[PDB]
């Protein structure tokens, strides 16, 4: 679990959005496992607008933050789940480091900001939702 707060914006995996989100849609994305709410109160972080392959994620099933290097936003198919059958998702970025279905939401960071959230994984390989490309996170 886990979700990102900028300005009037909940940012959160689509698969984990409550009713209230839903209600309050602002954008969402089954390819990329995204949905974006609207909040009352001011989010306090900040996106990050870069292009960092290097940064710290917080892996919930270890207590953890592990440095990791990381790939570009890609589109990478992803094996079936209780969520979604088996499909191409995009703006997807890989890390060799550990994650278990549990750990999505937890946070991916860099020196700029807050960078995507974990959405999938296996195998020694944890994936992150890039978030960096929704430029208007930053603007009302
Ligand atoms: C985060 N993580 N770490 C290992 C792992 C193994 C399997 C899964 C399966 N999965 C894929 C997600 C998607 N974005 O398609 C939806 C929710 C989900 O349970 C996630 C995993
Ligand atoms: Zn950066």
């Not at 890989?94 to 999938?120: N, W, Y």
């Given at each position: 679990?886990?979700?990102?707060?900028?300005?009037?914006?909940?940012?959160?995996?689509?698969?984990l959005?409550?009713?209230?989100?839903?209600?309050?849609?602002?954008?969402?994305?089954?390819?990329?496992?995204?949905?974006?709410?609207?909040?009352?109160?001011?989010?306090?972080?900040?996106?990050?607008?870069?292009?960092?392959?290097?940064?710290?994620?917080?892996?919930?099933?270890?207590?953890?933050?592990?440095?990791?290097?990381?790939?570009?936003?890609?589109?990478?198919?992803?094996?079936?789940?209780?969520?979604?059958?088996?499909?191409?998702?995009?703006?997807?970025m890989?890390?060799?480091?550990?994650?278990?279905?549990?750990?999505?939401?937890?946070?991916?960071?860099?020196?700029?900001?807050?960078?995507?959230?974990?959405?999938?994984?296996?195998?020694?390989?944890?994936?992150?939702?890039?978030?960096?490309?929704?430029?208007?996170?930053?603007?009302?």
């Open positions: 679990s886990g979700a990102i707060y900028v300005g009037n914006y909940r940012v959160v995996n689509r698969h959005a409550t009713h209230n989100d839903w209600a309050n849609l602002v954008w969402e994305d089954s390819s990329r496992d995204l949905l974006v709410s609207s909040t009352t109160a001011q989010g306090c972080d900040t996106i990050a607008r870069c292009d960092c392959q290097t940064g710290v994620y917080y892996c919930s099933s270890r207590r953890k933050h592990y440095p990791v290097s990381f790939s570009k936003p890609s589109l990478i198919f992803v094996e079936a789940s209780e969520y979604y059958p088996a499909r191409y998702q995009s703006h997807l890989l890390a060799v480091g550990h994650s278990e279905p549990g750990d999505c939401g937890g946070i991916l960071r860099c020196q700029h900001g807050v960078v995507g959230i974990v959405s999938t994984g296996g195998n020694g390989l944890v994936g992150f939702a890039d978030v960096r490309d929704l430029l208007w996170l930053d603007e009302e």
